Amino acid sequence: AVDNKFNKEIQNAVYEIFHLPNLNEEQRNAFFQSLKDDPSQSANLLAEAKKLNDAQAP
Amino acid sequence: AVDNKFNKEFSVAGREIITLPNLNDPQKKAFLVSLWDDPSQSANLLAEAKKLNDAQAP
């Protein structure tokens, strides 16, 4: 029984998501809720966040 | 069993922390880990981060 805490992965995804300047507040809240519920999916969530950030660039 | 909506508080307070220009990279990351781990402490953490930022001003 391996205890995977994902400390590095979570903290990296959080820091990067906060720096994506084109996300809205609702989007950040959705990503953080999904990460808290399933921290194994940090890479999926960060990739999606980056894609939305870029789609919402002025 | 109250849901304290601390996911939304993490999002709002975290953004404020990362927008403090005079904090360094490990300082902002230390604040964010504490916030993620205990979002009930958001106001205390934000206050501490603001005082630290305002004090490290050029």
Residue numbers in the entry:
A (entry chain A), B (entry chain B): 0 to 57
What's in the article?
We adopted the Z domain of staphylococcal protein A and its affibody binder dimer complex as a model system. We next generated libraries at the interface of a weakly associating dimer (Z+ ZSPA-1) with micromolar affinity to determine if we could affinity-mature the interface by coevolution. To clarify these inter-residue co-variations discovered from the sequence data, we determined crystal structures of 10 coevolved pairs that spanned a range of cross-reactivities and orthogonalities (5 from LL1 and 5 from LL2). From the structures, we could verify clear compensatory changes between the residues showing the most significant covariations (13A-9B / 17A-31B) in both LL1 and LL2 library mutants.
The three orthogonal mutants, LL2.c17 (VFLV/IVVY), LL2.c7 (LVLF/FIVK) and LL2.c22 (IVFF/FILV), were selected to compare differences in their affinity and structures. Each Z-A mutant binds to its binding partner with nanomolar affinity (3.98 to 44.2 nM) but has minimal cross-reactivity with other monomers. The backbone structures of the three mutants are relatively similar (Cα r.m.s.d. of Z-A after aligning Z-B ranges from 0.447 Å to 0.641 Å). The other two mutants, LL2.c7 and c22, have clustered pi-pi and pi-cation interactions at the interface (Phe31A, Lys35A, Phe9B, and Trp35B). Additionally, the same compensatory mutations (positions 17A and 31B) as LL1 mutants are also seen from LL2.c7 and c22 mutants. For example, we sampled representatives from the LL2 mutational pathway from the ‘founder’ pair (QFLI/LVIF) to IVFF/FILV. Binding of VFLV/IVVY and LVLF/FIIV are highly enthalpically favored and entropically disfavored, but by the end of the trajectory we see a more moderate enthalpy of binding coupled with a moderately disfavored entropy in IVFF/FILV. For example, A-LILFK has more Z-B binding partners (B=77) than A-LIFFK (B=15) from the LL1 library, and A-LVLF (B=53) and A-VFLV (B=42) are also more cross-reactive than A-IVFF (B=3) from LL2 library sequence data. We do not observe systematic differences in the structural parameters of the interfaces mediating specific (A-LIFFK in LL1 and A-IVFF in LL2) versus cross-reactive (A-LILFK in LL1 and A-VFLV, A-LVLF in LL2) complexes.
